[model samples]
Target: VQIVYKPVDLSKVTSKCGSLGNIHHKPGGGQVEVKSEKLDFKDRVQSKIGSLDNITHVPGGGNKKIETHKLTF
Candidate 1:
């Protein structure tokens, strides 16, 4: 979460990525009672950007989805 907390330099940041940890669960950590909407960080990010490519989740090996976005523009 701290990754996007400070001043994110758009010129320097070619990409942004991170994942959600089940703060209250274990193993595969699929318990929705925990990290689901643990925060609205996703909304803050997607709402601000005008990027052609929207941020999305990676395979995360079918576990906790690794969320992120890449940029070449």
Candidate 2:
């Protein structure tokens, strides 16, 4: 799929408690393929201080299965 590539517009930006998020995604003639992976203009969504979250957890017993009736061939 193609992604939009437009210049950043800060004129519409407003502040209440904080700045509201507003940006254009369509209407732009410019576009590029997502598979190209050449758009590195901004900082990543990931935090620089830390990597991915911890996945390991304390081990515990799993569910036990029970059969009310036996199967016969």
Candidate 3:
């Protein structure tokens, strides 16, 4: 999947005079660069758990291996 990042799409940005300028017409300043969406830690945790719950195990000889004890130095 390819992600397309567009700050100013064809809707807002248009080649009216065949040239794009630094100063926006409608908005005063055009010196601002927007930051994309940032992932939330709590939301990511819930998302990971939800994905893990959807995992399906087929019938096979392989058994489930779980961690019960932790190794100490």
Candidate 4:
């Protein structure tokens, strides 16, 4: 339940050498002290419904919470 904004785990950033992302932001070239962290993930769900408040990494590794009104079964 403590996955929100979890600190990036650099140790697991293996393979692909980040070939799936921009080497830089271009407007990134407009500055210095460049810093980056690999990422890759999307939305998902299975049963009983769920909630994804943009709260996860590209590889989304965690749980989510949801709320609804007038829920009927």
Q: After superposition on all CA atoms, how large is the RMSD of candidate 3?
A: 26.9
Q: Which ten residues in a row have the lowest lDDT in candidate 1?
A: 25-34
What TM-score, over all chains together, does every model reach? 0.15, 0.14, 0.18, 0.16
lDDT of 3 at 9: 31
Clashes of 2: 0
**Whose TM-score is greatest here?**
3
| Native-to-model Cα distance after best TM-score fit, residue 15 in candidate 1, in Å | 27
Against the reference, the lDDT scores of all candidates come to 0.41, 0.41, 0.41, 0.38
Clashing pairs counted in every model:
0, 0, 0, 3
lDDT of 4 at 30: 33
- Candidate 3 residue-wise lDDT, 1-73, digit = tens: 5555445434333223443345433533335345657655754354332221233343323444444544433
Ranking by TM-score: 3, 4, 1, 2
Question: Which candidate would rank higher by lDDT, 1 or 2?
Answer: 2
Best by lDDT: 2
- Give one digit per residue, the lDDT tens place, for model 4 in 1-73: 3434334333443343334453332232232353547545457744422333333235423344443434333
Better TM-score candidate (2, 3): 3
Local accuracy of candidate 1 as per-residue lDDT tens digits, 1-73: 2343343443432443477564442233232332333344644464422223333454534533343756442
TM-score of 1: 0.15
**Predicted candidate 2 versus true structure: per-residue lDDT over 1-73, tens digit per residue:** 6555455444433333443345334443444433443445566564343233334332333344443643443
Clashes of 3: 0
Error of 1 at 39 (Å): 23
